[PDB]
């Protein structure tokens, strides 16, 4: 994928970070003069970050300030000549809430391979959900699960309630299933006719309360598998995508962090 | 209309053989079908 | 193939000066034709290798005619008058 | 690249060595500088 | 019309026969009479050969010899002539699409004494084609504007939207752009109007054979640490005739020839004087011409000979000399001798241009005099022709003109093509792309996109693909742009694919799914053994002798059981694909694509899954 | 000013060959305008073969690749056939020698390729609301009537 | 007007173009489809200095150029000529593109508003 | 769109073209012109 | 009007002529505007005769 359309792509989502009131990444310096940046998908990270920045040092707290960034210019600031402006080190990293790592640590658990290591910032999504437009079907991409779930209960209640009004046509048809039946089993004379519509209405309401409890299982079925991701590992197959895979990622929308509840 | 398509090469193929008994022979079989084919359609054109 | 280049003139550009090639009837002439509106007209002008060119169509369409209409309503009065002081002057000393 | 996770406090690991001790405590193996 | 075919009969005489066909005697050229001897009489006996001669039926080879040396003037131009007109009938010929041998003599008349269609083609006129079925014969739905005739009436050059130029063979990209100033401008004079340009100065290069040549060794790095080095520079000076390097000048304004000329030996002696022995590649192959069929060329077979080509190119170079590194070029440099009288004959060629293009006084004599190439005075260069100039491996230099305005009306000549010149070829090639050239920028962007090809990419990206690094082709989706009210989340949906990164699904799909192609290689691996194994146990029929057929052959049998593995392999894995679902096919066409070096064929197990991926083929 | 894009060019490569690189080992672990020109001199099937007289290729790459495999009446009007010998007699005349000034038959081609292209795959409703009936000499109207009926009547016969 | 719209040899126009004996040409051809009816056949059209016509005048409506009838008319008849048939190897006028009796080839002209000089 | 689709969905026009119907009362004077070719 | 996909599915799938003749002139429809809109033409009467001594 070319770039100008991931960096479109990305564009909805913004990240936080710190800086001099001179429009200046702070940077935390450690050993051998290299140097860690950040970018924080909550402004409570970015506010700790300053509060312990004032406990050691107060001129550089007083003049920092928080910069709302949409990732499209920090994806940019990545994948550039980073010695162009400068680099001995500038390792950019990210940070993501630990509420959102533990929920994708759980699932990660769970889901058969127990394991305490995450790596990069969680990404949901649930298959069979997809957001459609009046031309074409796109596939959301959630950074919390909250509002994940916030669309996905809906989701379940609104098709299980058309699957329930589904059989409900199907069994209105199948009370005129049981009418054409009592006009098939002994209105006339005994014989072949007869006996073949009695197998002809057990087979009919046989599978219409099979399709009952199939409705009643997926009714039964759980919300749709919640699958979870890195954020990295996604923006380079994004970047580095071609053919099919290419025409998959082109109709990714990524949803903003507590939008869906406000 | 493939019985009347027929009829109409028909019509055309026994006017231009008797207009020219010479090559109506069998031998121009061939080349009574390159020209029927031709005037079938419009007129020849040279290239003046 | 007889037509090298047309020239689109005119202030609203629906004329054009057709210049012809040296094998066409009559040999190398300019005609003058009004256009009507034919949207497949330029297709079958460049799909033929026709130079085909226009003029410079200035954007403002009042400032660039408010001083050439000031000369077409003011230059008839100047017409009559001379042409009457010709005669009731000019010999009439 | 990205940064391992460790939900223990919630350890992590750089390609220096973070610690955002719930605060914060960016271990080293001392945030004075600014970008240029 | 087209189509006069013939059979094909042995004209082509398999060389390797003429040595017996010149080192024979007792023969001659003509026919018997058609009284005792048949038509096809070529061994005339003594007696046979005596009585011919003593009776007037046919004259002795010596006799031909003794005649073209007394015959002269019009007798002798007269017989080569004709002889000429022979060989040109009946012994090389074309081969079109069908096979046929269509002769040089025939279609030369086709081409030149056919007036009628030289006007028809001296027009445009596009007259539709009948449907050859008979009812209606409405015209075909080809129709058509062929984007080079829709571009006559334009100036510069033919906008033809690239699979046009593709299919074209339009295979020379452009590599760089310069100028050549009278007097470079100056910001601080008012607007800098006194630079006057000369010339302006465009390279071109072969971008296939760049991406085969330069492609193997320096693709896949990081093109600034493989521009930092100087051994690139002294590769992209050496390498360029093999590339068919091409450079074009346009005359930016109106110029006088002599001055021209002797600006260009002055700036060229320079280079010619100060020139080093060189590195030249060393023949592989002798390529002989294709008499029988002129236009058959060769390498479609070599590239492909056994499909193995790799041994069968080692065998033939096994008598020449080896490959001096990756790239495959077995270079030589200049000896102490043809260092010396080369450059001699280039300078002599130099000291005899400013008044070959000007002999005598009068321009009316000269040759450009005549076309529109120079002023109707013959005194000045029209502004807007260009020269070009396109250097062959060997010494060869070709160089044509082309005069400037509408692209209906444009001519092109053929001005000379030189042979043997090695000097001239590498004083050119430096002087352009050397390390002091006559305008440095354009040397510097030329290596620069000359090493973005051999990535396998082109400049110009005539294949619209989404990754070219210059100019990527877009898709044509809108990005999609999340609602807030939860109304357009449907879930009704049939299935999404999933675009979620390294998960604990991911993993056990890719486990299954490296579980069941570990099995497919077991048995590619066995199809491996049982066939070289009843290849061995088969009663062999075969005579000690033919060494080298014998490494091909056994090499190729090699070939045909890996061919044993790939469809062992595409069968079992295809199974289990259509058994795993469609997730696992999206994973392993992925990983095909990542795995696959963006440079060559084959290259940086990943080894195997991308040639599980060409089995899938 | 190309050199600018070059600049974007050779960053945008790195970062090309960087992730592809980087994405391999990940994936494999896990298991386990100034340039938009063209022109063509001579034939470009005559050059590959003058030139791979001096090569010795172990494998072909991408773009011999893709030559190779497109090597393998809708047009049967006599220009199309005239054109097709052009090139025949154009293609000796050019790999034949291994006034005096000659002109080629055919105009060298220049081109120009696009960028920023794509990926390969009535009646009216007018209504009055009273139908205005003309209400509110005429002997001639009535006999013109009479006149013209009878006349009918009597052409009827 | 009807007689001198073909190049029929009705005696009731003009004797532009005589045999030797002095009788009028006819250029009348039997249209093979569809004999027994003269009307369909095909035949050529006068030149258009020796005919006689009559002068209409007609108003357009408001809606006449974005109706589409006179394009569509100039496309359908400006969209048949000769072609190349390769089943006979020849160079052929097809019939659909030749005039019947009667019917003429239509020149249309417009005027310039500029060249009055009122 | 439109109405009646389903019947809209259900000779040797396409050679000598369509024959004109606004000429037909000239017919009999055609014939007539053909049989006495002295007028 | 809004056809069904049997329609012309028994239109097309059908070989005969006029098979395809009675799929198509047995075939029904249905006609969503009629729960949807109710569409009227008026014209505003006038109140002066145009030929009075008012007008
Ligand atoms: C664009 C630079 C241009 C020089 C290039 C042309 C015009 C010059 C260089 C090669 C010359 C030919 C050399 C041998 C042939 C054949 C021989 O029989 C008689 C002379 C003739 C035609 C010569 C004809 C003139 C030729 C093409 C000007 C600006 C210096
Ligand atoms: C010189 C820098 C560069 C010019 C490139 C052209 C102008 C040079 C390179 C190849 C040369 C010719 C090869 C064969 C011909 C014909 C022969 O008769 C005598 C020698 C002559 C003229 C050679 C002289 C002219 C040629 C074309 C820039 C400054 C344009």
């Not at chain 2, 031998?27 to 031709?38: D, F, L, Q, W």
């Not at chain 5, 005539?462 to 989340?489: Q, W």
């Not at chain 5, 066939?531 to 057929?549: G, H, K, Q, V, Y």
Request: net charge neutral; glycine share 8%.
């Amino acid at each position: 994928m070319a770039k100008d359309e991931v960096k479109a792509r990305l564009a909805p989502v913004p990240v936080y970070t710190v800086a001099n009131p001179k429009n200046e990444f702070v940077l935390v310096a450690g050993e051998n003069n290299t140097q860690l940046g950040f970018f924080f998908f909550r402004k409570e990270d970015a506010e700790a970050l300053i509060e312990k920045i004032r406990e050691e040092n107060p001129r550089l707290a007083r003049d920092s300030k928080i910069l709302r960034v949409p990732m499209d210019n920090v994806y940019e600031v990545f994948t550039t000549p980073r010695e162009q402006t400068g680099l001995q080190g500038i390792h950019f990293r990210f940070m993501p809430d630990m509420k959102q790592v533990a929920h994708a640590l759980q699932l990660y658990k769970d889901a058969g391979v127990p394991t305490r290591q995450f790596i990069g910032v969680p990404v949901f999504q649930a298959e069979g959900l997809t957001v459609t437009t009046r031309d074409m079907q796109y596939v959301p991409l959630f950074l919390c699960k909250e509002d994940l779930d916030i669309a996905v209960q809906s989701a379940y209640v609104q098709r299980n309630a058309a699957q329930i009004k589904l059989y409900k046509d199907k069994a209105d048809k199948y009370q005129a299933d049981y009418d054409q039946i009592a006009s098939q089993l002994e209105a006339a004379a005994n014989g072949r006719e007869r006996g073949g519509l009695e197998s002809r209405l057990a087979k009919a309401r046989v599978k219409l309360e099979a399709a009952r409890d199939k409705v009643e299982s997926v009714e039964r079925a759980p919300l749709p598998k919640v699958e979870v991701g890195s954020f990295e590992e996604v923006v380079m197959r994004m970047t580095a995508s071609a053919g099919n895979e290419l025409a998959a990622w082109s109709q990714v929308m990524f949803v903003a962090p507590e939008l869906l509840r406000d | 209309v493939e019985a009347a398509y027929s009829a109409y090469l028909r019509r055309i193929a026994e006017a231009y053989l008797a207009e020219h008994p010479q090559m109506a022979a069998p031998e121009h079989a061939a080349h009574v079908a390159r020209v029927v084919r031709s005037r079938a359609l419009g007129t020849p054109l040279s290239f003046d | 193939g007889h037509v090298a280049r047309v020239r689109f003139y005119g202030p609203e550009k629906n004329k054009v000066m057709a210049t012809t090639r040296a094998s066409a009837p009559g040999g190398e002439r300019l005609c003058k034709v009004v256009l009507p509106p034919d949207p497949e007209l330029l297709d079958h002008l460049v799909s033929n290798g026709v130079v085909v060119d226009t003029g410079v169509t200035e954007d403002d369409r009042l400032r660039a005619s408010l001083l050439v209409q000031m000369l077409r309503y003011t230059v008839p009065f100047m017409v009559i008058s001379g042409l009457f002081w010709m005669i009731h002057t000019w010999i009439l000393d | 690249x990205x940064x391992x996770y460790x939900x223990x406090x919630x350890x992590x690991x750089x390609x220096x060595x973070x610690x955002x001790x719930x605060x914060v405590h960016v271990f080293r193996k001392x945030x004075x500088x600014x970008x240029x | 019309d087209l189509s006069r075919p013939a059979e094909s009969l042995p004209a082509r005489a398999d060389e390797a026969a003429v040595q017996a066909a010149l080192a024979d005697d007792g023969g001659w050229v003509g026919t018997p009479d058609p009284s005792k001897y048949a038509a096809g009489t070529t061994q005339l006996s003594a007696r046979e050969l005596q009585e011919e001669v003593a009776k007037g039926n046919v004259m002795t080879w010596k006799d031909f010899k003794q005649q073209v040396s007394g015959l002269q003037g019009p007798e002798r131009e007269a017989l080569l002539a004709l002889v000429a007109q022979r060989v040109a009938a009946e012994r090389m010929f074309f081969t079109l699409e069908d096979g046929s041998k269509v002769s040089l003599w025939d279609l030369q008349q086709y081409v030149d004494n056919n007036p009628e269609l030289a006007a028809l083609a001296a027009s445009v006129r596009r007259i539709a084609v009948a449907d050859p079925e008979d009812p209606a014969g409405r015209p075909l739905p080809g129709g058509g504007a062929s984007g080079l005739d829709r571009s006559r009436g334009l100036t510069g050059a033919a906008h033809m939207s690239g699979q046009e130029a593709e299919e074209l063979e339009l295979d020379w990209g452009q590599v760089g752009r310069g100028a050549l100033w009278r007097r470079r401008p100056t910001r601080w004079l008012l607007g800098g109007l006194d630079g006057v340009k000369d010339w302006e100065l465009e390279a071109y290069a072969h971008e296939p054979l760049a991406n085969q040549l330069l492609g193997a060794k320096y693709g896949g790095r990081d093109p600034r640490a493989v521009v930092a080095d100087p051994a690139y520079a002294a590769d992209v000076l050496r390498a360029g005739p093999l590339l068919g390097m091409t450079f074009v000048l346009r005359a930016a304004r109106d110029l006088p020839l002599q001055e021209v000329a002797s600006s260009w030996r002055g700036l060229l002696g320079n280079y010619l004087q100060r020139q080093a022995p060189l590195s030249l590649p060393k023949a592989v192959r002798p390529a002989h011409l294709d008499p029988t069929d002129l236009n058959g060329v060769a390498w479609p077979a070599l590239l492909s000979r056994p499909a193995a080509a790799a041994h069968a190119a080692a065998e033939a170079e096994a008598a020449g000399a080896v490959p001096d590194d990756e790239m495959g070029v077995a270079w030589r440099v200049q000896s102490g001798k043809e260092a010396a009288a080369s450059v001699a004959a280039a300078q002599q060629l130099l000291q005899s241009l400013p008044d070959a293009l000007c002999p005598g006084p009068s321009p009316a004599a000269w040759p450009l005099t005549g076309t529109k190439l120079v002023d109707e005075g013959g005194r000045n260069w029209r502004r807007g022709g260009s020269v070009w100039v396109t250097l062959q491996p060997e010494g060869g230099v070709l160089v044509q003109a082309q005069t400037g305005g509408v692209v209906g009306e444009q001519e092109s000549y053929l001005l000379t093509h030189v042979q043997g010149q090695e000097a001239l070829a590498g004083a050119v090639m430096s002087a352009f792309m050397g390390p002091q050239p006559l305008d440095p920028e354009l040397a510097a962007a030329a290596r620069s996109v000359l090493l973005v090809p051999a990535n396998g990419f082109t400049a110009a990206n005539k294949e619209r693909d989404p990754n070219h690094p210059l100019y990527p082709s877009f898709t044509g989706v809108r990005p999609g742009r999340a609602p807030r009210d939860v109304a357009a989340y449907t879930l009704a949906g049939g299935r999404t694919p999933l675009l979620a990164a390294g998960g604990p699904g991911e993993a056990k799909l890719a486990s299954e799914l490296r579980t069941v192609m570990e099995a497919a290689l077991a048995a590619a691996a066995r199809a491996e053994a049982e066939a070289l194994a009843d290849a061995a146990t088969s009663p062999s029929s075969t005579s000690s002798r033919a060494a080298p057929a014998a490494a091909l052959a056994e090499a190729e049998a090699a070939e045909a059981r890996r061919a044993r593995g790939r469809a062992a392999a595409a069968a079992v894995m295809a199974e289990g694909l259509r058994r795993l679902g469609p997730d696992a096919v999206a994973m392993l066409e992925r990983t095909a694509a990542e795995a696959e070096a963006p440079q060559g064929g084959g290259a940086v197990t990943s080894s195997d899954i991308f040639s599980l991926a060409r089995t899938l083929e | 000013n190309d050199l600018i894009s070059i600049k974007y060019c050779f960053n945008n490569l790195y970062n090309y060959i960087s992730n592809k690189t980087a994405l391999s080992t990940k994936n494999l672990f896990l298991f386990s305008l100034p340039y938009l020109k063209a022109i063509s001199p001579l034939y470009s099937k005559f050059m590959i073969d003058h030139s791979l007289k001096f090569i010795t290729p172990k494998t072909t790459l991408k773009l011999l690749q893709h030559k190779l495999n497109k090597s393998p009446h809708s047009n049967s009007r006599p220009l199309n056939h005239y054109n097709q010998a052009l090139k025949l007699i154009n293609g000796y005349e050019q790999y034949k020698n291994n006034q005096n000034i000659t002109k080629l038959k055919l105009n060298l081609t220049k081109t120009t390729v696009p960028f920023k292209t794509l990926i390969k795959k009535n009646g009216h409703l007018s209504v009055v609301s009273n139908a205005n009936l003309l209400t509110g000499k005429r002997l001639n109207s009535y006999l013109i009537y009479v006149n013209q009926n009878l006349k009918k009547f009597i052409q009827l016969n | 007007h009807p007689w001198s719209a073909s190049v029929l040899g009705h005696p009731a126009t003009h004797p532009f173009y005589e045999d030797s004996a002095h009788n009028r040409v006819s250029m009348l051809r039997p249209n093979p489809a569809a004999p027994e009816d003269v009307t369909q056949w095909f035949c050529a059209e006068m030149p258009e200095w020796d005919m006689e016509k009559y002068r209409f005048y007609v108003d357009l409506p408001g809606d006449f150029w974005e109706s589409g009838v006179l394009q569509r008319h100039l496309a359908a008849q400006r969209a048949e000529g000769a072609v190349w048939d390769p089943a006979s190897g020849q160079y052929i006028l097809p019939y659909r593109a030749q005039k019947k009796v009667f019917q003429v080839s239509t020149e249309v002209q417009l005027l310039d508003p500029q060249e009055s000089w009122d | 769109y439109g109405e009646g689709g389903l019947r809209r969905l259900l000779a040797l026009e396409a050679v000598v073209g369509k024959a004109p119907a606004t000429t037909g009362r000239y017919r009999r004077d055609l014939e007539l012109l053909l049989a006495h070719p002295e007028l | 009007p809004r056809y069904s996909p049997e329609a012309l599915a028994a239109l097309y799938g059908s070989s005969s002529s006029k098979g395809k003749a009675a799929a198509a002139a047995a075939a029904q429809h249905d006609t969503p505007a009629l729960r949807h809109l109710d569409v009227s033409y008026h014209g505003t009467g006038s109140a002066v005769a145009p030929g009075s001594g008012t007008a």
